[PDB]
Design a protein around this nucleic acid. Structure first.
Ligand SMILES: [Mg+2]
Ligand SMILES: [Mg+2]
Ligand SMILES: [Mg+2]
Ligand SMILES: [Mg+2]
Ligand SMILES: [Mg+2]
Ligand SMILES: [Mg+2]
Ligand SMILES: [Mg+2]
Ligand SMILES: [Mg+2]
Ligand SMILES: [Mg+2]
Ligand SMILES: [Mg+2]
Ligand SMILES: [Mg+2]
Ligand SMILES: [Mg+2]
Ligand SMILES: [Mg+2]
Ligand SMILES: [Mg+2]
Ligand SMILES: [Mg+2]
Ligand SMILES: [Mg+2]
Ligand SMILES: [Mg+2]
Ligand SMILES: [Mg+2]
Ligand SMILES: [Mg+2]
Ligand SMILES: [Mg+2]
Ligand SMILES: [Mg+2]
Ligand SMILES: [Mg+2]
Ligand SMILES: [Mg+2]
Ligand SMILES: [Mg+2]
Ligand SMILES: [Mg+2]
Ligand SMILES: [Mg+2]
Ligand SMILES: [Mg+2]
Ligand SMILES: [Mg+2]
Ligand SMILES: [Mg+2]
Ligand SMILES: [Mg+2]
Ligand SMILES: [Mg+2]
Ligand SMILES: [Mg+2]
Ligand SMILES: [Mg+2]
Ligand SMILES: [Mg+2]
Ligand SMILES: [Mg+2]
Ligand SMILES: [Mg+2]
Ligand SMILES: [Mg+2]
Ligand SMILES: [Mg+2]
Ligand SMILES: [Mg+2]
Ligand SMILES: [Mg+2]
Ligand SMILES: [Zn+2]
Lengths: 94, 137, 48, 58, 78
RNA sequence: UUAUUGGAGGUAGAGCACUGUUUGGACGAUUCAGACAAACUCCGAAUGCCAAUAAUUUAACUUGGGAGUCAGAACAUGGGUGAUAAGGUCCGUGUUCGAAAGGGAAACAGCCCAGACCACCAGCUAAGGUCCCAAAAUAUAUGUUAAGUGGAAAAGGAUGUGGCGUUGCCGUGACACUGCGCCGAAAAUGUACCGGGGCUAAACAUAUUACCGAAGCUGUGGAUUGUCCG
RNA sequence: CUGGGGCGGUCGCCUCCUAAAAGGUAACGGAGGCGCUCAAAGGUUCCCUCAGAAUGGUUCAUUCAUAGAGUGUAA
RNA sequence: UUGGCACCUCGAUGUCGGCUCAUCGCAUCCUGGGGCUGUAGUCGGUCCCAAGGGUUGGGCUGUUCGCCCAUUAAAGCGGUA
RNA sequence: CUGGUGACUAUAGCAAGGAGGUCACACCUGUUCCCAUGCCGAACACAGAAGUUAAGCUCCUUAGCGUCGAUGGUAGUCGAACUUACGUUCCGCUAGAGUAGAACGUUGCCAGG
């Protein structure tokens, strides 16, 4: 139910994103009612653990910068080759 | 399958083979699929041979989906002719396959049976392949 | 259309106005009012 | 508020447009130099030919 | 054998002949086209072969008309 | 030439709204889902192009006198053709050769670095290199390979070895990704693609510090012709 | 002219693709068309709106129908 | 091999077959060593190692090729303009 | 607030429900005149006013279809380095699709009230 995210500060380059995905992290974005858009990054292993523990339509307690906002996985991007999640869309369900 | 019933133009520019697979990258009709990891033309004869192998091993019972169709005709000049004097005549029909494209899907058999059937089919194809399951979180 | 024609005025000796027609469609000498420079008015120019 | 630009790579084998930009910067021969006031236009020229020049804040 | 193909017509050099924001004299062709791919706007005429031309001296402005149509006008330079 | 601003247009990609092609359902042609297109488009870049008024720069145009040229080539890249053959052929774009010497690529027009006014037994660098041939590191740190792999190849095969993980039973397995190697691997005068000797690093991958290295740049003297003020 | 020449094919003009989102751009590259026609199928003023489907009737009517019709002719 | 291309040679690089004389490769025809065999033996089939030596006299055809006669342990396939 | 008439990329349209006609708009009643149907006063045109909100039309509440639409990422790609690998790397630009979301119009005059 709980996942910790790190705010992505500034505009990442292509190399920054490549290093992020190599280091086992997933870029993500949080938006929706009660929250302002913010780019974050979560650990892939931890995210998979949370998602298997709550399912697909579940509610995730996402620590986003001194705020424990509740989100749902609106969408995600997957690379079928190398079997790696590449991006997540966390929708703050209010 | 085999070939289109008709096409507007029977002499077509050959398709571009660089890049990654544009679509059809997920299992959507069955439980398991054969995913290409390498790029090539795939002919109708190759498709038919792979299909016969997979369905014969599965002993019917299951369902087979062929996700690629040979839309593109390709031409070949007659044996031993000089260059020029127009384009040749249609020789066969091909599909372009790029990494990620699901080639076949199966359902209605166990996981082990699906794996064996897809391996047998893959040995008929000009591409490297990987066994894939229906994608969930 | 089918054949070139020349339309002639009743005062001007010029045959300035050539045009075409279909002989089967209009076998009769076609005529129409055309401007005539030498008279500075429209007159009746008829097929030759 | 002034940059020193040095032409450290030859214009031989470079496309004509890069050569024209190098010429517009006042650089003549290899290892020649210019000093110009910094502004967005000069920055654009430098960025166009940055693989051929070295910039020092002067 | 032989090819039945091999024919083409002379290219007709269509398209824009003056730039948006450029000053033109009266009679200057702004656009060659088939049909009204761009429509005649203010102080702009449409010739018999659909050529768009400036009817006054002024500055060329390409502008949108409606949702999926375009036009070009000429405006007298103040 | 760049910055900024405005504009024209339909490529790459993508998509299926039209045309055509196609797979599996459902209902009794339509509908759900999923694909394909140089001559399909509901969409649509990067660039390039046309202009307008700031920075840098040095051309531009017109009119005359005099030409030569109208066999091109390779490389890279966007495409047609051919067989996603050719040192093939035909167009677009860029470079070099042509008409260009010098250093590197063993040798090697077209690749990489770089454009030779002349002289010097001065110096700094480029590509490329530093065990001997043969100038400069038998350099430093971490690791990989054991195949002379390095120093020419594939489907496929395999308890070769290293890094990563998700996992299961209770040391042991399954699975997924990945680094480097192995087999697959047969040609004609003589070893015979590392250039040779040789090398287990003198191979490979990261990082760092030196140095060598050209007719490039600098230093000194000189020649010629211009510009600014001899 | 010609991937030697011959034989075959082609030779002017129009449209599309190739053509790399200005224009231009080749091959014995991929497709087609022209050597006219119309006295209205020209000009002007006024008015008008299609294909198709469904449903009823021993062509008509209703309903939808942004054009999926038509535009003399190839695109 | 039949070709594709048209890069050397058109101020000349003699074309097929045979004869003479060879020389090299190994994808081995024989001989030597060996694994499997639906290898009892005698013979075979197939694969692996192996290039030392050996590997034919006639009929027909210009022929190469090929068919045939009679042999032989065998009558190998290719490169060298 | 209504109407007339413009401007704007449907954010404006369609769809479903409800509310209203004092004037106004409309439906409406007719065909003598002007005018009118390849036939018909259906339309156009003209007299009007019996009546009616019933429909058009205005007003209200809905995001159902349609339209608009970020941020984040992906594809592609200018340039550079590596490289010949159906490529890799760096840099700038940055889609399409989809997501949150916007949206059941905004406004210029003229007149009435
Ligand atoms: Mg799709
Ligand atoms: Mg043309
Ligand atoms: Mg005309
Ligand atoms: Mg495409
Ligand atoms: Mg389909
Ligand atoms: Mg298909
Ligand atoms: Mg397209
Ligand atoms: Mg080539
Ligand atoms: Mg060539
Ligand atoms: Mg070229
Ligand atoms: Mg030059
Ligand atoms: Mg040289
Ligand atoms: Mg040199
Ligand atoms: Mg050299
Ligand atoms: Mg060598
Ligand atoms: Mg040398
Ligand atoms: Mg070499
Ligand atoms: Mg030094
Ligand atoms: Mg040396
Ligand atoms: Mg030395
Ligand atoms: Mg070696
Ligand atoms: Mg080797
Ligand atoms: Mg091997
Ligand atoms: Mg050697
Ligand atoms: Mg060497
Ligand atoms: Mg020197
Ligand atoms: Mg010098
Ligand atoms: Mg010929
Ligand atoms: Mg002939
Ligand atoms: Mg272009
Ligand atoms: Mg163009
Ligand atoms: Mg024709
Ligand atoms: Mg003709
Ligand atoms: Mg040959
Ligand atoms: Mg040639
Ligand atoms: Mg000769
Ligand atoms: Mg001679
Ligand atoms: Mg052997
Ligand atoms: Mg031997
Ligand atoms: Mg022998
Ligand atoms: Zn007259």
């Amino acid at each position: 139910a709980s996942l910790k995210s790190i705010i992505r500060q500034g505009k990442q380059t292509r190399s920054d994103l490549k290093q992020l995905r190599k280091s086992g992290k997933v870029p993500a974005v949080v938006y929706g009612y009660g929250t302002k858009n913010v780019s974050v990054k979560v650990d892939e292993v931890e995210f998979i653990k949370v998602i298997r523990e709550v399912g697909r339509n579940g509610v995730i307690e996402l620590g986003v910068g001194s705020k424990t906002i509740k989100v749902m996985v609106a969408d995600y991007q997957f690379d079928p080759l190398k079997n790696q999640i590449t991006h997540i869309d966390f929708l703050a369900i209010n | 399958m085999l070939l289109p019933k008709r096409v507007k133009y029977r002499r077509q520019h050959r398709p571009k083979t660089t890049g990654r697979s544009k679509g059809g990258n997920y299992v959507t009709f069955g439980e398991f699929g054969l995913q290409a990891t390498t790029t090539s033309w795939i002919t109708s004869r190759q498709i038919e041979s792979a299909r016969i192998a997979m369905t014969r091993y599965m002993k019917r019972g299951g369902k087979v989906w062929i996700k690629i169709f040979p839309h593109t005709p390709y031409t070949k000049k007659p044996l031993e002719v000089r260059m020029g004097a127009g384009k040749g005549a249609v020789e066969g029909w091909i599909a372009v396959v790029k990494p990620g494209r699901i080639l076949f899907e199966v359902a209605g058999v166990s996981e082990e049976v699906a794996r064996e059937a897809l391996r047998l089919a893959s040995h008929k194809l000009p591409v490297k392949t990987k066994f894939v399951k229906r994608e969930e979180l | 259309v089918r054949v070139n024609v020349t339309l002639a005025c009743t005062e001007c000796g010029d045959r300035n106005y050539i045009t075409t027609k279909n002989k089967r469609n209009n076998p009769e000498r076609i005529e129409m009012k055309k401007y005539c420079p030498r008279l500075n008015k429209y007159t009746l120019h008829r097929e030759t | 508020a002034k940059l020193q630009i040095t032409l450290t790579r030859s214009v031989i084998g470079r496309p004509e447009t890069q050569r024209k930009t190098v010429e517009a910067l006042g650089l003549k021969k290899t290892n020649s130099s210019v000093v110009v006031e910094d502004n967005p236009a000069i920055r654009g020229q430098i960025n166009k030919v940055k693989h051929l020049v070295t910039v020092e804040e002067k | 054998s032989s090819t039945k193909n091999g024919r083409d017509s002379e290219s007709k050099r269509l398209g824009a002949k003056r730039a948006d924001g450029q000053f033109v004299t009266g009679g200057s062709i702004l656009y060659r086209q088939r049909g009204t791919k761009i429509y005649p706007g203010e102080n702009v005429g449409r010739g018999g072969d659909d050529t768009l031309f400036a009817k006054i001296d002024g500055v060329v402005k390409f502008e949108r008309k409606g949702r999926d149509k375009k036009q070009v006008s000429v405006y007298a330079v103040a």
